């Protein structure tokens, strides 16, 4: 959709897209912009938007898993304001977090 346009996605619909069909979509286009809308702009920004967009896409996509996955806890010492009267401990994230 937004390929023949100067940086017009601007990290808006890419995250509204899922984490499967966007990559299933870039593989569908068969041409680029002849007038080069999204190419006449310095491509340096034409890159730095799609990436962060897909990032937030996958982030909000997995945000649902935070309902069946544990709150990720610190794995290191990381002295605590209540580190008196008890010494902190890390936690090696070895367990399978998938609850039942």
């Amino acid at each position: 959709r937004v390929v023949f346009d100067p940086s017009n996605p601007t990290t808006f619909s890419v995250e509204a897209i899922a984490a499967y069909t966007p990559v299933a979509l870039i593989r569908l286009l068969n041409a680029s912009g002849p007038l080069q809308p999204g190419h006449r702009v310095d491509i340096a920004d034409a890159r730095s938007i799609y990436t962060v967009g897909a990032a937030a896409s996958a982030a909000r996509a997995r945000a649902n898993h935070n309902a069946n996955t544990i709150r990720r806890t610190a794995m290191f010492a990381e002295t605590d304001p209540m580190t008196w009267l008890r010494p902190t401990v890390g936690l090696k994230r070895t367990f399978n977090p998938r609850i039942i």
Partner: protein, 48 residues
């Protein structure tokens, strides 16, 4: 869904290594190129 266990074998449908999930140009193809039968609960953790 959040009612059952995670997939184990690569011939399982809900497994990222079935024939289905091999979407072209997905980072799953590398792990199947390398023939590494790793599940998705690990792939989920690359975000952090």
């Amino acid at each position: 869904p959040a009612d059952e266990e995670a997939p184990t074998t690569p011939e399982d449908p809900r497994h990222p290594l079935h024939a289905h999930q091999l979407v072209p140009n997905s980072l799953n193809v590398y792990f199947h190129n390398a023939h590494l039968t790793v599940d998705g609960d690990a792939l989920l953790t690359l975000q952090e």
